[PDB]
């Protein structure tokens, strides 16, 4: 989706996929205030109280029925923490019975799609570039660095399959409203599969550093109906 | 005695002089991107409006 | 240095006796050091047309 | 008596004068860096820099080592604990050179555990053909069985006392490793595919390239272990400069047997 | 009401790197128009298969590697 | 002198090249933030060529040439001679080339940015980037000698510790009784040899493939380019874990010597500490999650890097025990020492959240793991680094460093590098790339509170250059007036003031109980130790 | 042969050590005339380098 | 065994016939070619395993 000023949390969740990601990130840093609470806690009270105690206990060294307790306690949060972690992994490679195949090649400056599933009744695949815009050509209210002009149409509701790969230099896939992200290495090729279930345009960003112009690709990608999509994919 | 005064008087006096010194290297800055002054904000967001891109949540992009 | 664990002969500055005062060549090797990538971010620029 | 130690060294450990060849092998290090890098890229024109890099280096080696021998065998602080600090120093070393082969042996197995795209589902691929391991290959592990033979036979022989076998049993050993040069020289001659061969003439000749690149110094260790023995410098009680061959063969039997394993008897 | 249509899990490649599911695909296709043919439409799951999940730039490859005869995979099955 | 072999002045020739490397490597850091202070290209023009040069020219100028050299070489070559019992290293003629191959390290790095070209490669120099087909110059080409020329000085000075420690202690010495900095060390100097020459085949095959064309990364070939993913990697996440394997045996030093009291379970110490340094070995591509790995080759990972985390813990909790108890001295190393103590952990949370494979999904390349990795870069090997230095100059220097002056230099770093760092956090949550010269308009938020940040640190570092002139100049009328603390430990609550006099240093280790500087020939007796 | 020969003069020779051996006058000074070339004309082509002239 | 491939070579540097057998894309890479000549391959290489004829056609 858009970024947001001044934010400090996700981008809209607009994926089961990603609406894992949020219910982990959450699950984890329950377990991440526990131990910054006992940390933050533990350090004031030996400063301030222990600033003053001119006598220093000099003979506890060893602490045998303390030495065992926090040797388990890393052993006890990791145990069921992993849990919630290795049920998002098992289940994120969903790629059983899928719907819709859409390509994103990246050329070390743009993408390139092409919707190559031959529902559309032409019989050729519809590809496209991805071109961000000049501040030249910069239509007045469009986003700097993250509005294309040749943007891209996915259905709603639907079990897609990108298939994410290049030609040249690796940066990888990245929309973060969906949690999608792979790494479009040169030789081979990734998948993922992401059911959007809403609405509306998401932006991303290509993380992984291509050249000089890096900053120079967004990944522009709106969600329409299925059949306002088709009318897309019937006239191109 | 007189001591921990002036540590806090460094400190104080630090955050001062940082600030102060970088307000020299911005008016001696290049010119700001055009899409930052207001108005450019203001219209990218019924934009966002006529396709409901944070439902929950804000797209203000409004940061002048 | 070898020998004469003085107070000052560990270092191989001449802080001491110096001709010149010490802040020129302290602030000097220094300073020195923080205006390298400032001639980085000059004949790479100038070359590259900017300015 | 108490006047003769108070004019003596009272602890084992040696204390070497402030030599300036630390500084001219950094020096070489640099023109070797900076010049291998500039002329393929042009600003010279000639490539012989290298050449200048390659010999400054070498020379600034055996001053280095001129200064050891005559701390070795001329002045002497190598005490028992000085004697297990080198041969220590050395062997945990051969363990960092022993790793660097786990940075050429694990390409093999990124090539060939699982088939690649670009090239064939086969390996070694299609237009690229392998040398069998009942071939001349097998006379180099052979060759080096040999050697794993002759080392200790003249290892020992050094210790037993007499000159007979000490000094001609480290002449056989010599030229036992330059004909293994020109064994591996047969294959940089006379075999198909080149180190631009893709993948497959990549790391063929990386694996068995960096163990050619060890018998020019190997051959070279042998060059001043028969001179210092005809010299009279090394002794039988006694041997840094000795003892450190040995661990560079009697490890080479061990990296050789793993490299035959995967290069040539699973690499067809 | 659902129109669309393409290529299920394919169990044997159940990866991310979906690679050699491009590769072989276009293999077992162009293994079935010399070998055994009886008909198209047993032999179309692998011409369907291989317009989906690869790039166009590979197809435009992979046909000039077989034209030169320079195709580095076992493109004659006869 | 220059070529003088001993010991004790090649450490002070690393100290010496680490803060100029230093006031080199943050001035790029200050372009770098200057540049990421507002959207649209400021101080430079329009290049976003020269970004991806700076920022590899920092970002290795900070790793190879400021915290490798002082944690490893201005401080092991002097402290590990001095506390053990020797009198120099064990190897001390190669001690030399050691340092003076850095400087050549250095012109092998600073003419890498002044040719016509500049290596826009990243840190990670990744080959389809830096192939010769993308980078053409003879920039990157000086690029990977420079990281060369440091992997070898770093691995011949770690051979010169596992030699030193294993053979020439004194009488008493046991293998079981070292002081906790040279088990640092020793401990790292088992991952220094055992992780170099893996990143030594992996730097030289990309030389091949960039001027002797043999494709072991090249795709036009079969030569991958996620070879280099974990065989550079496979190097990488040891290193990061030598940068603070000594930053956790200084802090074990300061931490219960400024509170009088031995420290908790130093036998429980010796043993988690080598646990951190062989369980980094199998844990190496948590920073490729992404890149295309098996649902278990990621499910292995994402178990076994939270398991460093297991005795990462147990020498954190010691060392909130070992200050339970005792008296608490907040000079200024007891002040740097527990801040490390909530920068670092903090800077540990993030890294199990960055830990799992579920999760770095949304997290890789952003600036969440800027935020992450910096919370133990320049705050637990800064912070432990400033921690060595002020518990070590005027024992070694011989002149003490103006007290009063070094305390608001901790809370200039303090505070303003947090400033920095912290917001890094929501940038990167919402997904700001890496290495971008620009970016998209809702990112100008954060990044004008990080880049009046960087002022804030960077006029510490000049405040601490002062401190480092008040201490050669004046430096002997400190401690004759109350500018600063002469005492590292005030005597107990009945021990009579003059009777301190006579039994002045109760250390726990030799560094103390030498002069101050220490003498030329500081060990020509065989000590002994109980 | 020449073991106790050289250690007569190797110890107490009052020398450096690289200075040490008889036959090393010869060893210094055409190995002082490589050593002052080796190390500027790397770097003499540097500011030839900048320029883009190549050879 | 040695003198049935030294006379193996013989053949190949005589006479291809017609000509290369049209060697595949991983073979052969020229990208950056070498420095201390024109297009040498290594530092010695004979011609009866290392052709190279370009084939543009
Ligand atoms: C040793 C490691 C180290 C240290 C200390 C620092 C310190 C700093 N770094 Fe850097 N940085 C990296 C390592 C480090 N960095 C790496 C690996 C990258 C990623 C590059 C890549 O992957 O693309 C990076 C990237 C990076 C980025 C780009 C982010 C991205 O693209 O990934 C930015 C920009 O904000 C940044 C800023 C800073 C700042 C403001 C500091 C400030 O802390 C500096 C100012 C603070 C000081 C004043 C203290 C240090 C000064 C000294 C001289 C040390 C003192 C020691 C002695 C004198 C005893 N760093
Ligand atoms: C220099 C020091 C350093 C240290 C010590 C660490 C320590 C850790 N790091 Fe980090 N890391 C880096 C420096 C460091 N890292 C760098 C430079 C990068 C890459 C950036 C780049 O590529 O440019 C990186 C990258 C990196 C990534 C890659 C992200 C990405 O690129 O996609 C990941 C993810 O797994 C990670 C995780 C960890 C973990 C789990 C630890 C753990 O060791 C830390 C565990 C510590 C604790 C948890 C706190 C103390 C313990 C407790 C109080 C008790 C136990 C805790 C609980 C039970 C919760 N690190
Ligand atoms: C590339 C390298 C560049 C390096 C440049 C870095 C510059 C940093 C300089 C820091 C410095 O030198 O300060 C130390 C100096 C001596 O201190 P001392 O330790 O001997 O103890 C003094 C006594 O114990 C208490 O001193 P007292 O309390 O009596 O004086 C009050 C003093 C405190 O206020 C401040 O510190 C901030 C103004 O105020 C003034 O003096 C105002 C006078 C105009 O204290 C001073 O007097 C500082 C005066 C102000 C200097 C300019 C400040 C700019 C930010
Ligand atoms: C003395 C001169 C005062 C100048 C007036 C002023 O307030 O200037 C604001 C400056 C500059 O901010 P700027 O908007 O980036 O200006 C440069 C714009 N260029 C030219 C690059 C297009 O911005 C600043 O100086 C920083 C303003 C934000 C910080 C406010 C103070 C925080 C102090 C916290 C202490 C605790
Ligand atoms: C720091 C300074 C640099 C240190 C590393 C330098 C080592 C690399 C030098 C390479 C020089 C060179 O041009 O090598 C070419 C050789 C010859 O290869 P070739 O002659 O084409 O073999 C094919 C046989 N035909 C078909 C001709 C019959 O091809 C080879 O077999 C190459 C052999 C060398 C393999 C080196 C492996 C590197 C691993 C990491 C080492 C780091 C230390
Ligand atoms: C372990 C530590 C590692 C670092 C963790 C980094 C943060 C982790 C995520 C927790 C963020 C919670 C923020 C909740 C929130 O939405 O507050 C924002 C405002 O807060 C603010 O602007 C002030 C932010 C204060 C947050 C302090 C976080 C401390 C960590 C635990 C809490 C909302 O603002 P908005 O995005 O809706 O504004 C839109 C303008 N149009
Ligand atoms: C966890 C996070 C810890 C964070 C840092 C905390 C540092 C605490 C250090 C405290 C001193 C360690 C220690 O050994 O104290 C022992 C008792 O404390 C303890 O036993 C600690 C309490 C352990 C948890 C409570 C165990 C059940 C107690 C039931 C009470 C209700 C004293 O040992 P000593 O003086 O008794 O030994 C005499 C034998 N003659
Ligand atoms: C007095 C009038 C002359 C200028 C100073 C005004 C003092 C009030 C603060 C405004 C000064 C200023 O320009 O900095 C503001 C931000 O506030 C700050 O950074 C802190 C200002 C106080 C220190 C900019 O904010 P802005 O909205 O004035 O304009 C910004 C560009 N558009
Ligand atoms: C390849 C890169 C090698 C890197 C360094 C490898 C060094 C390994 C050996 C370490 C030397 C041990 C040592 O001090 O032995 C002394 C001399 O050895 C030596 O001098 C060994 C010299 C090795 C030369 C080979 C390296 C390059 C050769 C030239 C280019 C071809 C003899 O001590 P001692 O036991 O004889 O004392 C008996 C007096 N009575
Ligand atoms: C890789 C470099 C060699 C690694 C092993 C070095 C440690 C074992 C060999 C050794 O002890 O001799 C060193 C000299 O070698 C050297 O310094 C020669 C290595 C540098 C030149 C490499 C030339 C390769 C051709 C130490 O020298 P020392 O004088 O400190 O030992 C004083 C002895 N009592
Ligand atoms: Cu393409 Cu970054
Ligand atoms: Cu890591």
């Keep these: ?236 | ?64 | 240095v070898h020998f004469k664990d003085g107070v000052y002969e560990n270092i191989p500055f001449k802080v001491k006796g110096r001709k010149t005062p010490y802040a020129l060549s302290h602030f000097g090797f220094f300073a020195i050091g923080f205006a390298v990538p400032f001639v980085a971010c000059y004949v790479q620029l100038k070359k590259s047309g900017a300015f | ?268 | ?78 | ?530 | ?55 | 065994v040695e003198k049935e491939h030294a006379e193996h070579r013989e053949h190949l540097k005589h006479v291809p016939d017609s000509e290369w057998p049209r060697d595949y894309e991983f073979m052969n890479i020229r990208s950056k070619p070498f420095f201390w000549g024109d297009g040498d391959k290594t530092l010695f290489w004979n011609p009866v395993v290392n052709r190279h004829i370009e084939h543009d056609d």
């Design chain 4, 1 to 268: 008596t108490h006047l003769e130690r108070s004019r003596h060294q009272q602890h084992p450990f040696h204390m070497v004068m402030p030599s300036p060849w630390p500084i001219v092998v950094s020096f070489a290090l640099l023109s070797l860096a900076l010049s291998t890098a500039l002329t393929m890229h042009g600003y010279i024109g000639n490539m012989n820099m290298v050449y200048l890099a390659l010999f400054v280096l070498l020379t600034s080696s055996i001053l280095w080592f001129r200064d050891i021998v005559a701390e070795a065998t001329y002045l002497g602080d190598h005490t028992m604990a000085v004697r297990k600090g080198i041969n220590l120093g050395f062997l945990m070393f051969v363990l960092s050179e022993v790793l660097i082969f786990a940075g050429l042996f694990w390409a093999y197995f990124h090539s060939a555990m699982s088939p690649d795209v670009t090239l064939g589902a086969c390996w070694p691929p299609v237009g690229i053909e392998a040398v069998q391991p009942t071939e001349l290959p097998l006379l180099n592990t052979i060759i080096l069985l040999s050697s794993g033979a002759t080392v200790t036979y003249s290892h020992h022989a050094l210790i037993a006392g007499n000159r007979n076998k000490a000094l001609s049993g480290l002449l056989i050993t010599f030229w036992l490793i330059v004909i293994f040069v020109t064994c591996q020289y047969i294959e940089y001659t006379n075999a198909a595919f080149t180190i631009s061969d893709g993948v497959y003439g990549s790391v063929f000749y990386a694996g068995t390239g960096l163990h050619f690149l060890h018998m020019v110094m190997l051959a070279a260790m042998l060059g001043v272990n028969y001179w210092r023995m005809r010299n009279y410098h090394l002794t039988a009680g006694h041997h840094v400069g000795y003892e450190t061959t040995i661990i560079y063969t009697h490890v080479l039997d061990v990296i050789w047997l793993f490299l035959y394993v995967v290069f040539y008897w699973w690499g067809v």
């Design chain 6, 1 to 530: 002198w220059l070529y003088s072999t001993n010991a004790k002045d090649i450490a002070v020739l690393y100290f010496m090249l680490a803060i100029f490397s230093g006031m080199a490597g943050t001035a790029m850091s200050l372009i770098i933030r200057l540049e990421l202070a507002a959207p649209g290209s400021q101080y430079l023009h329009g290049n976003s060529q020269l970004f991806n040069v700076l920022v590899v020219g920092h970002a290795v100028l900070m790793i190879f040439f400021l915290v490798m050299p002082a944690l490893i070489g201005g401080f092991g070559n002097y402290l590990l001679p001095l506390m053990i019992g020797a009198t120099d290293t064990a190897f001390p003629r190669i001690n030399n080339i050691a340092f003076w191959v850095l400087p050549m390290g250095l012109v092998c790095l600073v003419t890498s940015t002044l040719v016509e070209s500049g290596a826009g490669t990243g840190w990670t120099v990744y080959p389809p980037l830096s192939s010769i087909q993308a980078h053409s110059g003879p920039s990157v080409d000086l690029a990977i000698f420079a990281l060369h020329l440091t992997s070898i000085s770093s691995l011949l000075g770690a051979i010169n510790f596992i030699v030193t420690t294993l053979n020439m202690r004194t009488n008493g010495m046991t293998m079981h009784k070292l002081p906790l900095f040279v088990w640092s060390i020793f401990i790292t100097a088992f991952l220094l040899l055992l992780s170099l020459p893996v990143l030594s085949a992996g730097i030289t095959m990309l030389l091949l493939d960039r001027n002797f064309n043999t494709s072991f990364f090249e795709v036009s070939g079969g030569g991958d380019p996620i070879l280099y993913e974990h065989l550079f990697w496979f190097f990488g996440h040891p290193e990061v874990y030598i940068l603070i394997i000594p930053g956790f045996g200084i802090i074990s030093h300061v931490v219960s010597t400024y509170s009088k009291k031995p420290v908790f379970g130093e036998i429980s110490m010796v043993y988690a500490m080598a646990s951190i340094g062989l369980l980094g070995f199998l844990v190496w591509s948590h920073h490729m999650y992404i890149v295309g790995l098996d649902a278990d080759t990621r499910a292995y990972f994402t178990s076994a890097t939270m398991i460093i985390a297991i005795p990462t813990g147990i020498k954190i909790f010691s060392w909130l025990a070992t200050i339970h108890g005792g008296s608490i001295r907040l000079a200024t190393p007891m002040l740097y020492a527990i801040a490390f103590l909530f920068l670092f952990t903090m800077g540990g949370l993030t890294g199990v959240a960055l830990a799992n494979a579920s999760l770095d999904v949304a997290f890789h390349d952003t600036y969440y793991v800027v935020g992450h990795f910096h919370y133990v870069l320049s705050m637990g090997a800064i912070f432990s680094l400033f921690a060595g230095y002020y518990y070590w100059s005027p024992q070694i220097l011989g002149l003490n460093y103006n007290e009063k002056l070094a305390q608001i230099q901790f809370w200039l770093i303090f505070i303003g590098a947090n400033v920095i760092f912290f917001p890094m956090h929501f940038l990167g949550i919402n997904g700001m790339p890496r290495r971008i010269p620009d970016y998209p308009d809702a990112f100008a938020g954060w990044n004008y509170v990080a880049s009046i940040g960087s002022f804030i640190a960077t006029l510490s570092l000049f405040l601490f250059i002062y401190i480092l002139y008040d201490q050669l100049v004046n430096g002997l009328n400190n401690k004759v007036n109350n500018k600063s603390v002469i005492y590292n430990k005030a005597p107990d609550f009945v021990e009579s003031n003059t009777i301190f006099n006579l039994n002045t240093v109760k250390s726990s280790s030799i560094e103390f109980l030498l002069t101050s500087p220490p003498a030329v020939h500081s060990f020509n007796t065989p000590a002994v130790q109980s």
């Design chain 2, 1 to 64: 005695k007189g001591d921990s005064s002036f540590i806090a008087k460094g400190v104080a006096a630090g955050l001062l002089f940082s600030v102060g010194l970088f307000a020299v290297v911005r008016m001696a800055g290049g010119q700001d991107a055009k899409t930052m002054n207001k108005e450019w904000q203001l219209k990218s967001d019924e934009y966002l409006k006529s396709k409901n891109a944070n439902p929950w949540g804000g797209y203000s992009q409004v940061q002048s």
């Design chain 7, 1 to 55: 042969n020449k073991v106790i020969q050289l250690q007569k003069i190797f110890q107490s020779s009052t020398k450096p050590l690289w200075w040490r051996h008889p036959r090393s006058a010869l060893y210094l000074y055409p190995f002082y005339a490589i050593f002052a070339v080796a190390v500027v004309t790397p770097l003499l082509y540097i500011p030839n380098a900048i320029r883009g002239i190549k050879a």
């Design chain 5, 1 to 78: 009401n659902s129109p669309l249509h393409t290529v299920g899990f394919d169990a044997r490649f159940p990866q991310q790197n979906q690679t050699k599911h491009c590769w072989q695909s276009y293999v077992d296709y162009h293994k079935c128009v010399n070998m055994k043919g009886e008909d198209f439409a047993p032999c179309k799951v692998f011409w369907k298969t291989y317009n989906a999940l690869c790039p166009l730039d590979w197809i435009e490859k992979w046909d000039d590697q077989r034209e030169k005869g320079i195709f580095a995979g076992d493109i004659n099955s006869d």
């Design chain 1, 1 to 236: 989706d858009v970024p947001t000023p001044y934010a400090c949390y996700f981008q809209d969740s607009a994926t089961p996929n990603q609406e894992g990601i949020l219910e982990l990130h959450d699950n984890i840093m329950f377990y991440l205030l526990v131990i910054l609470g006992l940390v933050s806690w533990m350090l004031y009270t030996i400063v301030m109280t222990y600033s003053k105690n001119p006598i220093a206990y000099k003979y506890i060294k060893h602490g045998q029925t303390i030495e065992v307790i926090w040797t388990i306690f890393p052993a006890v949060i990791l145990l069921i923490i992993a849990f919630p972690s290795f049920i998002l992994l098992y289940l994120c490679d969903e790629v059983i019975s899928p719907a819709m195949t859409i390509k994103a090649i990246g050329y070390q400056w743009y993408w390139k799609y092409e919707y190559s599933d031959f529902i559309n009744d032409s019989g050729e695949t519809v590809e496209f570039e991805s071109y961000v815009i000049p501040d030249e050509l910069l239509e007045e209210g469009q986003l700097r660095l993250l509005d294309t002009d040749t943007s891209m149409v996915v259905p709603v509701d639907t079990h897609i399959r990108f298939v994410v790969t290049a030609a040249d230099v690796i940066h990888d896939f990245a929309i973060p409203s969906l949690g999608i992200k792979v790494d479009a290495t040169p030789g081979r090729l990734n998948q993922v599969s992401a059911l959007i279930q809403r609405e509306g345009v998401f932006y991303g960003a290509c993380s992984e550093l291509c050249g000089t112009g890096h900053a120079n690709m967004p990944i522009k990608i709106e969600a329409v109906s299925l059949p306002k999509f088709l009318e897309w994919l019937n006239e191109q």
